[PDB]
Amino acid sequence: LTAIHRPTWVSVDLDAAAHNLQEIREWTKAKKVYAVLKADGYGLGAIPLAKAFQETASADALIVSNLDEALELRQADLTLPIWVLGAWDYSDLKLFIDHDIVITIPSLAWLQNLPDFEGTLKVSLAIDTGMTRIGFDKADEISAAKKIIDKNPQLDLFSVYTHFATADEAGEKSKAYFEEQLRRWQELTINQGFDPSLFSMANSATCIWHHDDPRISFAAIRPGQLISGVNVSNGELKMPPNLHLERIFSVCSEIADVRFVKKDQSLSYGASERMPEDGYVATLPFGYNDGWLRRMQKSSVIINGKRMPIIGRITMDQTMVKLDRKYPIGTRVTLIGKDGGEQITVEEVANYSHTIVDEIQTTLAPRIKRIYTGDLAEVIGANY
Amino acid sequence: LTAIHRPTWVSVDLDAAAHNLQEIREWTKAKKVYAVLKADGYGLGAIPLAKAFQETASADALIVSNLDEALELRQADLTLPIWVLGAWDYSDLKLFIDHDIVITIPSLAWLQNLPDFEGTLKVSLAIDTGMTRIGFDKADEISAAKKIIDKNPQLDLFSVYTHFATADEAGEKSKAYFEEQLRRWQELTINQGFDPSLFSMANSATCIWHHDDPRISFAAIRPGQLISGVNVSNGELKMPPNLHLERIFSVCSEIADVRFVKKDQSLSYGASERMPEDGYVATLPFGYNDGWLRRMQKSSVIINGKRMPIIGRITMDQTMVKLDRKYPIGTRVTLIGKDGGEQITVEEVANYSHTIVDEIQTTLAPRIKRIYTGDLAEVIGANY
Amino acid sequence: LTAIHRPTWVSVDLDAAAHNLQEIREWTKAKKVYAVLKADGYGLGAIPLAKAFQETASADALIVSNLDEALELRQADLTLPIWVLGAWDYSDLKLFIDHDIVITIPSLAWLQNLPDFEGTLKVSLAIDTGMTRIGFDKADEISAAKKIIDKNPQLDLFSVYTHFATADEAGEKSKAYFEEQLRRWQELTINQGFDPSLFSMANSATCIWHHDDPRISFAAIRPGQLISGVNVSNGELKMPPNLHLERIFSVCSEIADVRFVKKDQSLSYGASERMPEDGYVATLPFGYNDGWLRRMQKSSVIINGKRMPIIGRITMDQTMVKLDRKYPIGTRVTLIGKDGGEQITVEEVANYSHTIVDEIQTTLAPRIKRIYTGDLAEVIGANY
Amino acid sequence: LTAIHRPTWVSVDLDAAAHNLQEIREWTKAKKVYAVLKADGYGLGAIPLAKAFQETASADALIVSNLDEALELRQADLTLPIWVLGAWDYSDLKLFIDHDIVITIPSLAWLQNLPDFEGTLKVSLAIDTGMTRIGFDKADEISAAKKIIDKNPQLDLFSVYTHFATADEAGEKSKAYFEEQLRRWQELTINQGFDPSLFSMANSATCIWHHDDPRISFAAIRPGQLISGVNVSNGELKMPPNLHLERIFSVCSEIADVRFVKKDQSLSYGASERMPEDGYVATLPFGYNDGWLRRMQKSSVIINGKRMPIIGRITMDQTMVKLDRKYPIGTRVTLIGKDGGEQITVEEVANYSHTIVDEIQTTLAPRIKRIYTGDLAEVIGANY
The missing domain is CATH 3.20.20.10 (Alanine racemase)
Structure with a gap:
């Protein structure tokens, strides 16, 4: 368990x-x-x-x-x-x-x-x-x-x-x-x-x-x-095509539950939608409780390099996805942004007689932890 | 400056x-x-x-x-x-x-x-x-x-x-x-x-x-x-009177601007309120942009152990306070909570066939930095 | 149906x-x-x-x-x-x-x-x-x-x-x-x-x-x-006890679904809570989508003059209640406010050189319809 | 006045x-x-x-x-x-x-x-x-x-x-x-x-x-x-170019204050921005208090068929505009939407054993009054 x-x-x-x-x-x-x-x-x-x-x-x-x-x-x-x-x-x-x-x-x-x-x-x-x-x-x-x-x-x-x-x-x-x-x-x-x-x-x-x-x-x-x-x-402005800056961050989650749901079954209690074919459905432990969710597109996520669709009603802490095959619980999921290049900070300045206030703050999912991936991460001791 | x-x-x-x-x-x-x-x-x-x-x-x-x-x-x-x-x-x-x-x-x-x-x-x-x-x-x-x-x-x-x-x-x-x-x-x-x-x-x-x-x-x-x-x-439940747990955290700010405002002058552009007496007024660099503000009472703050009143219209990034004497810019201000004992975390659990999701998250001003005070803080190397 | x-x-x-x-x-x-x-x-x-x-x-x-x-x-x-x-x-x-x-x-x-x-x-x-x-x-x-x-x-x-x-x-x-x-x-x-x-x-x-x-x-x-x-x-201030002003408004809903749920069954998908006894449970068609909900207590509602408890997870559009007996769908439900005397309007004034802006606005469930009840309502032609 | x-x-x-x-x-x-x-x-x-x-x-x-x-x-x-x-x-x-x-x-x-x-x-x-x-x-x-x-x-x-x-x-x-x-x-x-x-x-x-x-x-x-x-x-989908549906609604306001502000003067207390030229500035009685504002572009408004720019800090109830000439207070202002064709309603459906819940609701400035303009409005008795 x-x-x-x-x-x-x-x-x-x-x-x-x-x-x-x-x-x-x-x-x-x-x-x-x-x-x-x-x-x-x-x-x-x-x-x-x-x-x-x-x-x-x-x-x-x-x-x-x-x-x-x-x-x-x-x-x-x-x-x-x-x-x-x-x-x-x-x-x-x-x-x-x-x-x-x-x-x-x-x-x-x-x-x-x-x-x-x-x-x-x-x-x-x-x-x-x-x-x-x-x-x-x-x-x-x-x-x-x-x-x-x-x-x-x-x-x-x-x-x-x-x-x-x-x-x-x-x-x-x-x-x-x-x-x-x-x-x-x-x-x-x-x-x-x-x-x-x-x-x-x-x-x-x-x-x-x-x-x-x-x-x-x-x-x-x-x-x-x-x-x-x-x-x-x-x-x-549009980024110059010849400059290849990589987006370094992702918001991720993981599969918390997988259910075999059959060709016509109801997807959730009270739900408009039924499921198109025999096949597996994953429940992901996020939903509208997560204020960051409102910057993400809600039709698809990435699992295993591939792009599987979001189906049904999203609740406060549950989002469901139709998988292409069966995956084990704990499988990583990556969210897709409405706008890949969107800012992750906001800046506020104020000018007064003797003082200048210059405040920058995150606008990316401030309440969740930052996890570091990649070989460099291993080498500097930040990848546990 | x-x-x-x-x-x-x-x-x-x-x-x-x-x-x-x-x-x-x-x-x-x-x-x-x-x-x-x-x-x-x-x-x-x-x-x-x-x-x-x-x-x-x-x-x-x-x-x-x-x-x-x-x-x-x-x-x-x-x-x-x-x-x-x-x-x-x-x-x-x-x-x-x-x-x-x-x-x-x-x-x-x-x-x-x-x-x-x-x-x-x-x-x-x-x-x-x-x-x-x-x-x-x-x-x-x-x-x-x-x-x-x-x-x-x-x-x-x-x-x-x-x-x-x-x-x-x-x-x-x-x-x-x-x-x-x-x-x-x-x-x-x-x-x-x-x-x-x-x-x-x-x-x-x-x-x-x-x-x-x-x-x-x-x-x-x-x-x-x-x-x-x-x-x-x-x-x-009410805390036992004999147990003296201390609230360890505060949300603070500082005076960004001090103005001598005279006995009848208008406090801000478009403002209902005028000021009762000759005396100093401090502008604090927070307002309704700060989601944490909605857990704080908006009639008073603490400056110098004392409790001075909030006057006028709070903007997106400005709150004004009538001071008892003149204070220099940079003087610390402490906010007062509607409810001193209010929780600073929320917990969400979900139970599924093979998995239990137990997520705790902060609900206290997630986008601002934690500063450590006190002698213990000095000794452990966290008080810069 | x-x-x-x-x-x-x-x-x-x-x-x-x-x-x-x-x-x-x-x-x-x-x-x-x-x-x-x-x-x-x-x-x-x-x-x-x-x-x-x-x-x-x-x-x-x-x-x-x-x-x-x-x-x-x-x-x-x-x-x-x-x-x-x-x-x-x-x-x-x-x-x-x-x-x-x-x-x-x-x-x-x-x-x-x-x-x-x-x-x-x-x-x-x-x-x-x-x-x-x-x-x-x-x-x-x-x-x-x-x-x-x-x-x-x-x-x-x-x-x-x-x-x-x-x-x-x-x-x-x-x-x-x-x-x-x-x-x-x-x-x-x-x-x-x-x-x-x-x-x-x-x-x-x-x-x-x-x-x-x-x-x-x-x-x-x-x-x-x-x-x-x-x-x-x-x-x-406290209302004078001898003056008996009646609160004239309520936010109401109705039972959209009744289910016999048995002594230990799970109340909803992903849910922490199981149900205490054999007996009926009503689903009400409101939840966290409804901004007005955040002024209501979320432990009880009134049905049939009586006060039945809210059980389980509230979703975006579903709230569940344990009923004392079975009720038919369409049965009225009345919400209970955190604070019965709470204001239903907010006022905003602004003063300028040649103009005074005085705006009052509702703060009670602005997106839902007003229904008029009582004999007076019948007589003036407002109770359909 | x-x-x-x-x-x-x-x-x-x-x-x-x-x-x-x-x-x-x-x-x-x-x-x-x-x-x-x-x-x-x-x-x-x-x-x-x-x-x-x-x-x-x-x-x-x-x-x-x-x-x-x-x-x-x-x-x-x-x-x-x-x-x-x-x-x-x-x-x-x-x-x-x-x-x-x-x-x-x-x-x-x-x-x-x-x-x-x-x-x-x-x-x-x-x-x-x-x-x-x-x-x-x-x-x-x-x-x-x-x-x-x-x-x-x-x-x-x-x-x-x-x-x-x-x-x-x-x-x-x-x-x-x-x-x-x-x-x-x-x-x-x-x-x-x-x-x-x-x-x-x-x-x-x-x-x-x-x-x-x-x-x-x-x-x-x-x-x-x-x-x-x-x-x-x-x-x-894109509307067929040959079909000419008119957008029938606008969100409007009016000029509450006009100030002659001179070539370098500060636009508001605490403000980053100064004003480019001698000329008039109007204060409009809306700001971030107005939840509808977040569907409107915040660089321009329409006054007198023309499109004048928004300058400076928007407060909770004040937005400022540089005018091309002087206008009198009470002059109508029309807001411009980020997306002219954006929906003004949201629909929510739920299906249960014996009942179908189908709720449509406004998403356009639910707390402000609807005013009817045009000759037809006069004729049907709705244009006061």
């Missing part, structure tokens, strides 16, 4: 995540790849994703949104450099240095008033080319800042960076905002004398749809949302 | 969890305490909870629902014995032995057909006293089984155990099911000759509301849901 | 609505009763409610929120005077007069600039005693206005009126706002010379919890939400 | 509904048109729809799902014949006859056991050609039944009818079920001797996608869901 205490789960193939970092490297001819892992790896797991990237050498740094995620990654024996995005308290200086964490330089004032400290602090200089309040938007302030950095050998400039807000939007008003931002980048950086291997310009969207524009430096790319294999444009 | 990338979170005080294991030990005069951690520590975090229990010695074993959680706990350097609840595949025998995992004996057939193996396999004998299909419901089968175990010195009997389904229900039909189950336990175990220090009878509800019944052995108690400090009876 | 095309419905007893108007008349010793019917009779049906009040003489006027509801009521052969609450366009003057519709005087300017017209225009003078922007808040403007009205015999003053915002709230800050408003009423109306039989002061809450305060005139009461028999205070 | 007590509504153009009945008559060369009005006119209003069809002569009968809807229609002075679909109690015989209501003959037994009665009972003979349990599936029973009818001159055969379940589905398995049903119709009706002008074969889907098949009689068509102008196939 068998007990199923894990009837559904999100299956995450870490090989495919690695592969995605590898593809987008080749697509952009990038030197360095900085893997952006916000919201616990876009709700897929930052640690396992990070370990997979360290072992395959497919990322050269990791970017995260909170100091406490940097510290946890360090605890998990990640050794790559890590860059935390919105943290720069003078009081955390010791933590940043001791744990080799890169931080963003937010303003000229911040650099001028840097207190004294031991060791090397790795810093990134953010170029406000428009749609943000973080960092530098004046050419004279940037060179003031480059002076303070150069003069101080305890400061190690990790990156001079920006990103384009409208690379993932379609149209004309957006092509022109893109140009405007690229103008500002150049106005703000040309003739400053920056070692050009420090430039980082490309977020996911920039990497995908502007890889042939020579004006964009791919010195250090910063792929985030695209790591999961989704379409970053939310419907607006 | 400050960036808030973590505007809300669930704060989990591990000292209070420890304290709860300690209280319920004294309440039941228990010798051994086995901490039940299903659904990732009842959605609060099994690893940090387990580490807190190992360091304080407040639990002597850990019980979990899936092998893969046992393996992860082992990876996290938990050394206490661990007992996985619904796993007993002969093919996992090696894993169980090598990682010191206790398993349940599900049936006499299973014991008779045990294959050969190396090392000591730790096993638990489950007494079906009624509301379940797992384990032994016949007095002769139990003694058959005790023979096979005794004869085999590689089998180490960890527990002989049951639990009462209706300890957490109120009434007369339920007091009698309780008696019926206790009759079966005794019919099934008296005169079997079991070392009585192996008996485990008490789930959370048994521990709470039947601690004075001498007929219940508290040799090894199995507190699960009560670890979090909630009321396990879902409204039905 | 029988077809159920109306499996659930809201049953509205018009006798009980009448009775409620009658009770609250006696409770307040009121002379005139103006029945407030917003949001289609609080989502219970303004026309049938209005006809029931005309036939029993239990209301002397009707108040509604939109001109178009006044016009419809007129079409339905309601002859009582009707007062539309937020309409006063000079262009609708003809409609108001021809259809005997009372309108509110919103401002002194409006009265001074009244154009010329034929017939008698019935008008109400609203006293802003605080929490509103409609009508008159200055003692000199009121007497200016009484002059213009008196001088013009085509204007017929129907009411001079206000209401108290905090009669339905509990506490000290609210008892004092009540006093403040009552001060303003008196400051604004004493020594103006108004025929006192025109005063209307009491909304539902004023009628219920302040019927013994001699300072409140009950000359013409304006019961609205209380007509349905709910508690207007949303939890805050 | 203006009060908006009706901030949103569903606008229903009755001319367009008439027009749809007219089109589908010409498309199928139909003689008689029976307008199917289930679920209160598909949640758009059966009475106003019926009156519009009587006045324009665009329907020759009306079909509804409940006796009580027939009775109400009669009360509203509809004189066309009415046919109630699942009612045939011998006890209602008097009601059916006195109110000229056609009923379905459900079985040979029912006809044989007809009791004695006065007047003419109009009856319809339903041919079970497959997917139903109502009516006749045997050739000998049909001729038995035609004998009993012919012999009795108080029975007036109104229709001999069926419909095709898979006319609104796409594919091969469905083209063949269609053929199978058409085979059964013919097997069951040819050589029976029925006056062929009594045949009714075509539901909405049959009318739309099979109008050129000569094997289908369009003697009396039964258009239901298509009356509203939606796509009956739910995505599966």
